Amino acid sequence: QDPMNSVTVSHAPYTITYHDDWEPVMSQLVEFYNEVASWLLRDETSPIPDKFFIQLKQPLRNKRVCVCGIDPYPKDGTGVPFESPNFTKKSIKEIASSISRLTGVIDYKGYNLNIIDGVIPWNYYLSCKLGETKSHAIYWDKISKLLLQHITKHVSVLYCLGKTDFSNIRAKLESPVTTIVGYHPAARDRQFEKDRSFEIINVLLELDNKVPINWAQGFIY
Amino acid sequence: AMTSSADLTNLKELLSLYKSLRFSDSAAIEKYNSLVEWGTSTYWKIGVQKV
């Protein structure tokens, strides 16, 4: 409530609370959201409208990696990308077993990309109609570009999960940023299991004289 | 491919060569420049340049 600001929009959730690092985009976010939100709000969503924007509370200046999925869990999104508080969603379980395999940590009760220093977990579209991936693509589009471009000014590496969903990601950005497009954790044939993105991200970081990501900070005991 | 062991292997060799930067033949310097190009092209932007 000091590095946190808020702005008023014309549709639910009505207030957007954001960390200072997001300021330069807030003005256009408000205009973009007001023109589409009523269309959006016609359906029940994952996450609920009160949670659409809670990731804007995160600092950007301390981030070196954005881990990005296309949109929220079709059900039970919390507004924090990939978060599954009771460790029940498949993607987060799979990501966690990659990190287990990678780091040698074998007993754990949870994993959350949002508690890892230097990481910002991100959803490209900020909602979907309950049960239906990508159903709100057409509404989010201009916002999604606005927000991901802003993010990519701060991070050294953008990692996107979903070969098909992200095959055109470059077009969506202005200035180049180190970009990795890996398999979705649900991809056929355990391809996600063979995907070495988490380690590749860290070599890329060292090549940009940055500190590698300490993936084990993700675990919950 | 971006995501395989072999991408990881090439990125690690490029980092190693970047750390010494001390090339003693044409081979080596060429390996380094050609890894930079491959990395740049595969991941769009990387932190090191051709020398």
Residue numbers in the entry:
A (entry chain B): -2 to 218
B (entry chain D): 0 to 50
Text from the published report:
Vaccinia virus DNA synthesis relies on three proteins: these are E9, the DNA polymerase bound to its heterodimeric cofactor D4/A20. The function of UDG is to prevent accumulations of uracil bases in DNA molecules due to misincorporation of dUTP or spontaneous cytosine deamination by excision of the uracil moiety and initiation of the base-excision repair pathway. Here, we present the high-resolution crystal structure of a complex formed by D4 and the first 50 residues of A20 (A201–50) that are necessary and sufficient for binding.
Two His-D4/A201–50 complexes are present per asymmetric unit. Most importantly, the structure identifies a second contact in the D4/A20 complex, involving A20 Trp43 stacked between D4 Arg167 and Pro173.
